[PDB]
Amino acid sequence: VNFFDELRIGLATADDIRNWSYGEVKKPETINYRTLKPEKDGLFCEKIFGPTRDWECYCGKYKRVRFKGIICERCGVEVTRAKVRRERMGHIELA
Amino acid sequence: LRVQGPREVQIHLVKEVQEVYRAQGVSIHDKHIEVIVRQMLRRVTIIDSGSTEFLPGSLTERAEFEAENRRVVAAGRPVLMGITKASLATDSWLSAASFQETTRVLTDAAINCRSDKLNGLKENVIIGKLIPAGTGISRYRNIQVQPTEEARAAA
Amino acid sequence: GDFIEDSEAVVAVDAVSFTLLQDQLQSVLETLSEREAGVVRLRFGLTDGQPRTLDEIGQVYGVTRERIRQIESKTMSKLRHPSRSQVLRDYLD
Amino acid sequence: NSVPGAPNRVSFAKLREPLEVPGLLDVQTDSFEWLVGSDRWRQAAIDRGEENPVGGLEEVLAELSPIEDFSGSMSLSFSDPRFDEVKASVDECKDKDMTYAAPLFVTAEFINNNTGEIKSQTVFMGDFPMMTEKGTFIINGTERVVVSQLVRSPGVYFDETIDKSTEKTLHSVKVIPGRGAWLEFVRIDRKRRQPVTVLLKALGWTNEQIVERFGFSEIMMGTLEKDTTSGTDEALLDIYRKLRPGEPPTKESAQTLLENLFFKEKRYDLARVGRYKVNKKLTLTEEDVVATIEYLVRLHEGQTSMTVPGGVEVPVEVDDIDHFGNRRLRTVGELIQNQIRVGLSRMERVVRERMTTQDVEAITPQTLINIRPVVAAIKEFFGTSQLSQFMDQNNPLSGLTHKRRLSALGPGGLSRERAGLEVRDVHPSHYGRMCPIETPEGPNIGLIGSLSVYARVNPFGFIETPYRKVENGVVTDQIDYLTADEEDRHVVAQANSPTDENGRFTEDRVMVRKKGGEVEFVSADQVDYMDVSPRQMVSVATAMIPFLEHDDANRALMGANMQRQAVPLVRSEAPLVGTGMELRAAIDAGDVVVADKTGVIEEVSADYITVMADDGTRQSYRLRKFARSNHGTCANQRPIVDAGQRVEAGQVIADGPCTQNGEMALGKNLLVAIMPWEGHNYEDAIILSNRLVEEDVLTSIHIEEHEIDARDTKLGAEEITRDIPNVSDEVLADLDERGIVRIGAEVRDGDILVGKVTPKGETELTPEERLLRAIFGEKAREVRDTSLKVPHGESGKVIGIRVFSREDDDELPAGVNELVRVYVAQKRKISDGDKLAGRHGNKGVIGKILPVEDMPFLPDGTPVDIILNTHGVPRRMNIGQILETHLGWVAKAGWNIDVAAGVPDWASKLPEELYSAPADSTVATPVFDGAQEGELAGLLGSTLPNRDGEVMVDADGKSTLFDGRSGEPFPYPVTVGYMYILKLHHLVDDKIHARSTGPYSMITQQPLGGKAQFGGQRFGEMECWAMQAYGAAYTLQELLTIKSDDTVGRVKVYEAIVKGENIPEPGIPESFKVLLKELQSLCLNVEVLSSDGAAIEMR
Amino acid sequence: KRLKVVAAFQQSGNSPMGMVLDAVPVIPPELRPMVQLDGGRFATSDLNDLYRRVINRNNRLKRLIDLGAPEIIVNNEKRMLQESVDALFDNGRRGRPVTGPGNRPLKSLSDLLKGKQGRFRQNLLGKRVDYSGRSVIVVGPQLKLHQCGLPKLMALELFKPFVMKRLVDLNHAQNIKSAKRMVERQRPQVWDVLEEVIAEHPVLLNRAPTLHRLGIQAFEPQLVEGKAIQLHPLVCEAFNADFDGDQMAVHLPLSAEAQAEARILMLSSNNILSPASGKPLAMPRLDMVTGLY
Amino acid sequence: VTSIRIDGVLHEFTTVPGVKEDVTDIILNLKGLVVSSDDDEPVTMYLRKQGPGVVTAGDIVPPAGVTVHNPDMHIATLNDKGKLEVELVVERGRGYVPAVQNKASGAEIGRIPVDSIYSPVLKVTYKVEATQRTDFDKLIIDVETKN
Amino acid sequence: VSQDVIVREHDCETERGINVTLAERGPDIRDAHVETSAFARTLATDAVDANGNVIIERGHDLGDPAIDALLAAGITTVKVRSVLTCTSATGVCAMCYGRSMATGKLVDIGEAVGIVAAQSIGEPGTQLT
DNA sequence: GCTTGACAAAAGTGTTAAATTGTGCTATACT
Ligand SMILES: [Mg+2]
Ligand SMILES: [Zn+2]
Ligand SMILES: [Zn+2]
């Protein structure tokens, strides 16, 4: 839009933080040491944060722009632009 | 300030500042100095509320203090403050954050649940808006141009 | 960290030339029979982006896969014909 | 002079050097030879000084031996370090990217006190980097220098600071050790609220002893009178909770705390420097901690003499941390020693613990020893350390001053930001030790300095300066090297004081320096020592400025800095008007080839020079040829000798990059005209004769190194190849079989050097791309094209190629199969925009170069090469540049006396044998005795001809120039002459950058700066201020959105310019979107609200 | 003072509970990237090791809770969990900072925003820009006050998309791809074209540091031989420009508004007097004084 | 003289076995060549020398229609192993033309382009003397050439 | 601190101002600096000699001629418009700010005079010893 | 201008062996 009026701050509640989150990252894992692919449930996990490649799920069963906005029933990755990997947040649920 | 009053401090500060620069051979028209000095006198300390909505010892803008203080049917004193402390008092919270003491600013802003109207020009720079000065002012940017019917005729 | 290029960043000159290439093809295809152009588009998935098998294109025009394979060879030698191909050469890469 | 092949350069010096300049690379070689303790250092310390020399390596090995656990049941002992012959030669290491190193060996003895058995084992510590003849190291193939650091010597230093409130006097003493906690008066370990009396009882001394020892000290009694601590053990408890808060103590822990902190040798490190400092001034002894407090009380009282209760008398006075007596200077050997000590202590930890869990009697010196931390200390010291730097070489002089540099920064010293200007100021004790005139102009001023010419480093780390002792108004030949402490002891006579016959004081009174240092005038009666010569205070580069004494220290500093900034020219002409140092600075640099034995030349080739000694031995020297230097200058060498030539030991066989016939040539001698010329040379700009282009007088070469490797990828192996997926056969036209550019080829910006390819997939080609493939039948290739091309804005000829292949045995890090390096070189003609300068700090860009036809030209028709503006000269106090401009003309045209009948009055003081020099003879005016104003005028008239007997310059150093443009003369006489001007390493080709579109940053989409990245310019905070003051909103918005951060807008704007459409409206800067995300991650809820509808989503 | 905080929570709807975290957000991966450099060796943000300590300790805490554990052990975990989330948000703000190899403290989330290298000053109030260049400057004595010497190589790259269009308009090149190669290889046809696009198309010249707005001024570009920049001798005063080897940046205004602002507001000849004292700046100096004197 | 070709060397920055001067310091020397040619069109000269000695411009064998006017000039000094085989191309023109790179010309990797100075004249000056009232002007010009 | 101060309107119309000294006590002699104080301003009220004739009307630019004219009439002070006394609701007003040092005329309504003031003050700071 | 059958490559699909990965455990005494 490029024209907004106000810009506001406040304390983020745990619920606000949970609503932002596209998933809870449960593992302190970055990427596999062999395949160098993002490890599931870790930081960088494609299930939560997003696809590494445009309209390409982790396993690849749905590789095409034909169906955007569907989730792969196998790897649970959403088919959309890898740009979301820049926009999407996770959360940690503390014990 | 307390002795001779708000308008006299200005005269003093301009003279003093203008003396240092005169010593070194520099020519600055007093108005430039006045623009800066004007920003140190813009607030007043709130001694009593009394029904406000304001808090004692707080520094509030003179205009904002006068209008809401009316409240149809709350006393303060002129306040001198340095340029650094003054700029931190600015209503723009992301303007203050970018200036200095970023963590202090963000924490107080999130507690006060502060809303920034994005009026100032530094705010508009950060977000990529058109600064509200020069050619960015409404009266200029909304100019509408058409050739005179007399001109279109000549083609 | 700030010396790292972004390798997936869009390059403006290519996206524009790709837009221009997408224009020249639309034109060159117009020099082909309605069915000739229609078969090439479906075969390579120009419009949809999803390529199609010879049997699938035969299903839309009501022919055998072999017929489509034939029509494919002809329009390709027509496309390879220099008057059509001369303009697309500089798009090699 | 005194150098066998020295060229003939006449000197105006009226004095005689009593002492040759010492070898000025010595500071590096001595420090290292001490560390390794080779016999060369053995003889040195045996023939004088102490009788038990301990090498640095052995010295740190004594500290380790033995290793004993708490049980003392086993002891691991070290001894006898040994080095093998160097692995590979320096030349081999620089080529193969290895480090020049000798393997080190040690004898490790492990003893079991229970079984009384001994196990002796030879141990390999690691490859220990060695030092080249030139004082450098080769670390992973790159030549590096270890700069010596300035530090505060261990000792007790007192400071008197007036009270910020009461204004009353206070001290305020400090004790700084080698290692361990430091104390201040007892404020300890940064714990305030500590009376100095409470600890004096903590040792067990009863109060009467305080009343006995304190004595005349009133506050000594009042502090114990005010202190409420009763008993020696109770005071240890008030010390225990302040030092170790949180831990309930024990009588075993309360007592050992103080004993272990300082007295114990392990925790508190006595320094040989600290041990020597205070031992004379007054591990740590209880005797020493009492004398501390005693010295203090007898300071604040005002007495100048303290006789210890049982000790010897010394002055009681404040100490100065900036006085060089208290300031070292840890040299390279020591900087290595300390890093070794750290490596061993980290190993001792694994040696101690290893003993416990290792099955006993199965432990050997090896099983307990793991050398990982020892070599890591060395490797991690040379890399990543600020004292270990890539040698600075664009010219021999730059390299020679890099060594000899001393800086106060680095680990073990103050940070650049914190230290105040008191350390940056020159101290009176810097005289003859650290050159005051040479430091950086940046905010390193005074923190970095160069060691003086005759300065010499002490085995303890204090700089010494040579002096000649005077006795009874007679200066002896005795030359004694004194430190700063012993210099404050005596009266240093001025270097030039009139000499009498066989020598003695002539002038009634003597110039002298006191211990202030405060200058004074006393007769010849009271002197002790005299200066060895002028320019003791000066450094090498400073000593190279002709007429230094005429230039303000400001422009002199700039002048020194810029000499080390010059670049070697192809021709390398030596300075027409020089100083002393040019000869000896070039040979000691090492970039010139010197013969080490008298003999004769057997062969002279461009490749090498062999000499047949009178000794019957045969020495040969391989010549560096077009070797690329660290920063890209050219190291090329040329032989100055012929086959038959006789030669003597120490002579100069071949010239280096910046040398001619043995002396440093950093520039060319040019014909200068000081008139302002048609607004072209203005505001420091310079104009040049196109001759300097045509004749390649300012030309210099340059060489760039390009590198690419072929590694193993998860998807395959990278392959260097000539096959590139999409190219015309034209681009490949210069590639050989393997796909690397052919030697002698010409390469433009974007040309291919090494073709390379890497696997790719799965590709998923675009439909529009797959259709063209079918039409033109080019199979989409299996692999992406990642290939080495020449950077934007560069060009030259391909010089050489270096290939390292895994197929060939070679060697390489895991994963790298093939490595190819390509060396490109180019001749750079002097170009408009290049930066030139003289030795006086006068600098400027070339603003124009004119056809030799139209230039100011002398009556001969001789065009001037440079026109320098008159206005920059007078106000800058550099007028020395005008002198050498006159002398330059003298030295070029020759001259005569002045006789007969007699010698004129001015020559009487006096030029000796200087009465006549032919045309083109070279001159030398040592800095602080040079030519003198009177002697210039007398020479200024002399001598014709051009060829015809007419004279081209008057006694004012002026001439009538004819404008080569209109042909008419210039109305007034103009100063002409010859000036020595250097070409400097700021060049237009390197500094010209331009960008339209290019790479963008990963996290922020901004363009990434620097020429390597093809980067854009930074529009900064201050630039936006200027933009706002103008009131240009659309310009400002543009720069900050569609010209940097706007990912859709920047590609649209491009689309618009190429279609000639209107430029579209800007979008949101990506960086701002990032900011919101970073604030969210702090649990700050940041919503962008419209007028409404409330929250907007960035997406 | 204590009222200022307590009062702030009343008027706003903020629950003060927010100051204690049940859940910690995790920043998107591309803002804390992990990527392999040229050669395959990997580099990543410090944030990931910081997030790793937190999640490691939270998971250990779950484990100890389920087994049952003496408070000494469990409380120790919670204390560790607390410190790790501190280091993540603000590192070193309490106690010694979490360090990596070489003992250099890891960069926290707060380290992103703060300082001269933080987002605001580094990436927000300023930034690097397209369509810009720089070189060393040389005297312009023959220039008109509104003009500047522009190195033709520099001009070519700056205007590249403009000429690419022009030489496609004229038939020099048949398609945009050919136009791009024609400019890169610098085939001689482009020069005549460059003069066309550059005509009456202004450019901004800046020299750092920029003290007053006069530190940026628009000029009329003139194609010049050589790699240096020709600067009119009367603007040195405003730029404080020494020819000792100073460099200056060139910026190309694009949009119609930007070009208008250049010609009208920032043009060299319209800014003469200093906007402080009103005294003249472009007035002659140095050589020009003594020449007229 | 425009370009030069030396058998052994493919470029300017190497040495030659036994020769005392590197190829670049030899190109500098060849700069001082003062030649003259009837032209037109390019013509190659030739130089070959073996065994010890000193090479000079006299050792250059010019083709028919060209001449070398300072054979006394030193080129390179050779030793027992030194051999120098180099051909030189003389073109015709005026002024100073910087070396034309063989990427711009049609030359192959072997050719070494060199800066060319075509300037017969060496140093030139003048002066005038009037012809008192009725004064006229008579100028003398001093012209020197390279031979 | 000053970046948000821009000229928002032509006139706030206030009669308030500040008194400039404009020399004194002679001859029996311009103030050393009337160039940075009195010049470029705009008169708040009419400048009147005894008894007197109103030599310059309120709102005058006060150029060089105006100071000479005034000085003749023997006026040893003048009340001047300043941004200190300006009553504008937002920003300041052109009349109160006075002449633009750059243009030499009344400031334009877009001008951001805070930034210009900030820079005019800080730039010479390098010369302040 | 189009279709049929024989046919081989290509592409999936299920079935199995090999490898990779995760977890438990080690009892002189050692705090
Ligand atoms: Mg400068
Ligand atoms: Zn999937
Ligand atoms: Zn107003």
E285: burial class by Cβ within 10 Å (0-12, 13-18, 19+)?
A: middle
Distance G40 CA to ligand 3 centre (A): 15
Neighboring chain G residues of E212 at a CB cutoff of 8 Å: 116, 119-120, 123
Task: Classify residue D897 by its DSSP letter.
Answer: -
Contact D992 E244 (CB under 8 A): no
Show the 3-state SS of D677-722: CCCCCCCCCEEEECHHHHCCCCCEEEEEEEEEEEEEECCEECEECC
Nucleotide nearest to C61 (CA to C1'): H2
Residue of D nearest to E161 (CA): D1058
> Do chains B and C touch by CB distance (3+ pairs < 8 Å)?
no
Show the 3-state SS of D195-219: CHHHHHCCCCCCHHHHHHHHCCCHH
Q: Please state, in angstroms and rounded to a whole number, the distance separating the CA atoms of residues D934 and D438.
A: 30
The closest of D704, D818, D813, D706 to D758, measured between CA atoms, is D818
| Residues D1080, D1082, D1084, D1090, CA torsion sign | negative
G110: nearest CB among D1025, D1026, D1031: D1031
**Tokens encoding E34:** 């992990």
Distance C75 CA to ligand 1 centre (A): 68
Taking CA atoms, D399 is separated from D98, D393, D395, D409, D818, in Å, by: 21, 5, 7, 20, 33
CB under 8 Å to C6, separation ≥6 — which residues?
Answer: D999, D1000, D1001, D1002, D1005
Contact A66 C49 (CB under 8 A): yes
Distance F7 CA to ligand 2 centre (A): 65
C46: burial class by Cβ within 10 Å (0-12, 13-18, 19+)?
A: buried
Distance D53 CA to H24 C1' (A): 60
Neighboring chain C residues of E37 at a CB cutoff of 8 Å: 4
CB under 8 Å to D443, separation ≥6 — which residues?
Answer: D416
D967: burial class by Cβ within 10 Å (0-12, 13-18, 19+)?
A: exposed
User: E strand or H helix at A24, and its extent?
Assistant: strand A21-24
By what technique were these coordinates determined?
Answer: X-ray
- Give D783's strand partners: D759
Neighboring chain A residues of B110 at a CB cutoff of 8 Å: 9-11
D1028: nearest CB among B110, B131, B141: B131
| Pairs of CB atoms within 8 A across D/G | 15
The closest of F113, F110, F109 to F42, measured between CA atoms, is F113
**Tokens encoding B137:** 């002012």
Q: Please state, in angstroms and rounded to a whole number, the distance separating the CA atoms of residues D38 and G44.
A: 90
Residue E102 · residue D385 · CB < 8 Å: no
Identify the three-state secondary structure at position F94.
coil
Phi, psi of D1003 (to 5 degrees): -75, -55
Task: Pick out residues 19-78 of chain C having their CB under 7 A from any atom of nucleic acid strand H.
Answer: 58, 62-64, 66-67, 70-71
Contact A13 E15 (CB under 8 A): yes
Side-chain half-sphere of D287: how many Cα atoms within 13 Å?
9
Residue D484 · residue D461 · CB < 8 Å: no
Q: For chain F, what is the largest distance between any 2 Cα atoms, rounded to a whole number of angstroms?
A: 75
Neighboring chain A residues of E30 at a CB cutoff of 8 Å: 85-86
Show the 3-state SS of D757-801: EEECCCCCCCHHHHHHHHHHCCCCCCEEECCEECCCCCCEEEEEE
Contact D1025 G118 (CB under 8 A): yes
**Strand H: which nucleotides have any atom within 7 A of a protein Cβ?**
2-5, 20-21, 30
Phi-psi region of D966 (alpha: psi -120 to 50; beta: other; left: phi over 0): alpha
DSSP for D413-439 reads: S--TTT--HHHHSPPGGGTTTB-TT--
A85 in D contact zone (CB under 8 Å): no
Q: Which residues of E touch G (CB under 8 A)?
A: 211-213, 271, 273-278
D189: how many CB neighbours lie within 10 A of its CB? 14
D1061: burial class by Cβ within 10 Å (0-12, 13-18, 19+)?
A: exposed
Taking CA atoms, E217 is separated from E214, E251, F63, in Å, by: 6, 10, 61
Residue of D nearest to E153 (CA): D994
Residue E40 · residue E24 · CB < 8 Å: no
Show the 3-state SS of G6-57: CEEECCCCCCCCEEECCCCCCCCCCCCCCCCCCCCCCECCCECCCCCCCCEC
DSSP for D542-564 reads: GGGSTTGGGS-HHHHHHHHHHHT
Does residue D66 have a cis bond before it (omega within 30 degrees)? yes
- Resolution in Å, one decimal place: 2.8
Q: Letter for the amino acid at D699?
A: T
Contact D797 F11 (CB under 8 A): yes
Q: Please state, in angstroms and rounded to a whole number, the distance separating the CA atoms of residues D702 and D143.
A: 18
The closest of B26, C24, C92, D991 to G120, measured between CA atoms, is B26
Taking CA atoms, D353 is separated from D109, D155, E74, in Å, by: 17, 35, 30
List the Cα angle D24/D13/D463 in 5-degree steps: 30
Task: Classify residue E30 by its DSSP letter.
Answer: G
CATH number of the domain located at residue range(s) F1-118 in this protein:
2.170.120.12
Rg (CA), chain B: 22
| Domain span holding position D455 | 448-530
Q: What's the CATH number where D473 sits?
A: 2.30.150.10
Neighboring chain D residues of E136 at a CB cutoff of 8 Å: 833, 835, 845, 986, 988, 991-992
Residue F115 · residue F99 · CB < 8 Å: yes
Q: Which of D1022, D1030, D1034, D1035 to mutate to test the interface with G (most CBs of G within 10 A)?
A: D1030
Q: What are the residues whose beta carbon lies below 5 Å from ligand 2 (ion)?
A: A 57, 59, 61, 72, 74-75
Taking CA atoms, D906 is separated from A26, A40, D129, D613, G11, in Å, by: 93, 93, 58, 49, 78
- Chain D nearest C-alpha distance from C63 (Å): 23
The closest of D375, D158, D176 to D284, measured between CA atoms, is D176
- Give G75's strand partners: none
Residue B123 · residue B95 · CB < 8 Å: yes
Q: Please state, in angstroms and rounded to a whole number, the distance separating the CA atoms of residues D473 and D501.
A: 13
Phi, psi of B59 (to 5 degrees): -105, 115
Q: Please state, in angstroms and rounded to a whole number, the distance separating the CA atoms of residues C89 and C76.
A: 15
Q: Please state, in angstroms and rounded to a whole number, the distance separating the CA atoms of residues D132 and D452.
A: 22
Phi, psi of D820 (to 5 degrees): -130, 125
Contact D1034 B126 (CB under 8 A): no
CA dihedral D284, D286, D287, D289 (to 10 degrees): 70
Q: Letter for the amino acid at D640?
A: I
Contact G110 B137 (CB under 8 A): yes
Neighboring chain A residues of C8 at a CB cutoff of 8 Å: 82
Distance D373 CA to H26 C1' (A): 31
Phi-psi region of E26 (alpha: psi -120 to 50; beta: other; left: phi over 0): beta
Q: Please state, in angstroms and rounded to a whole number, the distance separating the CA atoms of residues D234 and D231.
A: 5
Distance B33 CA to ligand 1 centre (A): 29
Residue D131 · residue D101 · CB < 8 Å: no
Phi, psi of B72 (to 5 degrees): 50, -120
Distance D349 CA to ligand 1 centre (A): 55
Q: Letter for the amino acid at D421?
A: L
